[model samples]
Target chain A: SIDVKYIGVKSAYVSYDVQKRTIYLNITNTLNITNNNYYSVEVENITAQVQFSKTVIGKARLNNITIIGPLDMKQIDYTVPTVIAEEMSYMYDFCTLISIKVHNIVLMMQVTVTTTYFGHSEQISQERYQYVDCG
Target chain B: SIDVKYIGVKSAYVSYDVQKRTIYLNITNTLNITNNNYYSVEVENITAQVQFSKTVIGKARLNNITIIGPLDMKQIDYTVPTVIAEEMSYMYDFCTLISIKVHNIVLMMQVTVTTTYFGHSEQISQERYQYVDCG
Candidate 1:
């Protein structure tokens, strides 16, 4: 039996929480395996979200979002997608073209995806953070 | 060969941060399985802690805690345990007789533990919170 394993974080996004003065996070799975192996990823129950803002003053916004699923094994190859939006009040704050800024606001995403092949399993996790500042 | 899988969260504890207005959580693994198969539990990387407080405002405290391992498979039978302690300031906070309170502070612990056997895996998680008021 040939066993193949892939463990990695696919993509991530962040949401701003102005009232709480904290950042919410959401992570996606980009890990895959192509062989006669069995693998699984377990997510611990935790609270997280995504936010948005601009570089200049008087230009920042917050929102709440959710991660659907890590997307388990499949018989076909396809990309799993998620949605990011703002709260009802701040609907017009974000621009159509989403540009991830490098500073001003910080976004961090950490997830542990595990893959098992043969008689052993390996776990790998990645953390990504981005800062936003709009001109 | 017949494979058996048992997945579930065993126990959990929560800590409060009076000064920071935040709470920390620590979840334990109580799920067990007995058979001639293989299984593993994966923990996602995240920030968490355990805190303490009394019903009276003046009798509250906080501490940093860590969950060692979910305690993997066994060649034999034995119970695995983790340690809980206090910061340098109050070494006496974690007295031998640790009493878990019901309120004044909220503590929540949520964990997703998975068990895989015979080409199948199932996930089970549990959340627990407690509040304390000291005289």
Candidate 2:
């Protein structure tokens, strides 16, 4: 068995637009090899998603990723385009709809990486959640 | 059911640190008085939390808040500090633990409010998420 460990997420930036109907996110995650059984890992894909309750708001996809050297930390960036067709009036009326500031909103990331020793593959998928303002 | 709608979040900033073992967030939420049945609304409290699977990372709380002004747009702000006495190593090893920038980590918010109208105690409790960054 390979012992893969959870590292951390590095610099991250996410932005959404109503007019353009898009969600853009760029971030880097650090992955480490805790077992000698696996030597190197290949980052295959990375994604960012926004949602409210059970309703999925939007997404940004950066497929075909390649991470190399110093497995300690790798910065993988992506621009996620969210689906924003019916939310035009919503954003204009208030400010944003994807991640409601005053309530419970979530921004999640998913990464797929394959380890090249003993034919192993690992993934880093985590979700965390936030905001406020007045008249 | 008073049909209270969400306005938006403005000038939001959220930060977490290992040395302080805390997560602090400052934000403003705009709440609009809707349906014409209510003339005024009062924001009661707000909270932000991070969770992975079933384990809650921590929380930030700002309570006893009072947001009043124009009916259409009200800004309510909060500063929440999270519990981080145990995840210092995980954070220092990679970058961020609560909301991983490089993986599928998410961040969420919760709010409570009241309307001074007939029967509606407006509560803005919605959760959404995001991020961006570099090397």
What are the runs in model 2 whose C-alpha is more than 4 Å off? A1-135, B9-124, B131-135
* Residue-level lDDT tens digits of model 1 in A15-124: 11122323323423232223232434343443432222223323223234222222222343322232433232322232122222112222221111222111222222
TM-score of candidate 1 versus the correct structure, residues matched by position: 0.13
The top-ranked prediction according to lDDT is 2
Location of the lowest summed lDDT over 10 successive residues in candidate 2 chain B: B109-118
Q: Write the per-residue lDDT of candidate 2 for residues B1-135, one digit (tens) a residue.
A: 223223233221122212232332332233322222222322222233222222222233434444322222224333333433332232222222222133332332111121111111112233244342212
- Candidate 2 residue B88 Cα shift, in angstroms, is 25
lDDT at A92 for candidate 2? 20
Off by over 4 Å in 1: A1-35, A45-135, B1-40, B57-135
Kindly list the per-residue Cα lDDT of model 2 for residues A1-135, writing each as its tens digit.
123222233321121212232332332323332222223322222232222222221333334434321112324343334332331131223222232233223332111121111112222222233222212
Model 1 CA lDDT for position A59 = 29
**Model 2, residue A1: C-alpha shift (Å):** 53
Q: lDDT (0-100) at residue B33 of candidate 2?
A: 22
TM-score, one value per model: 0.13, 0.13
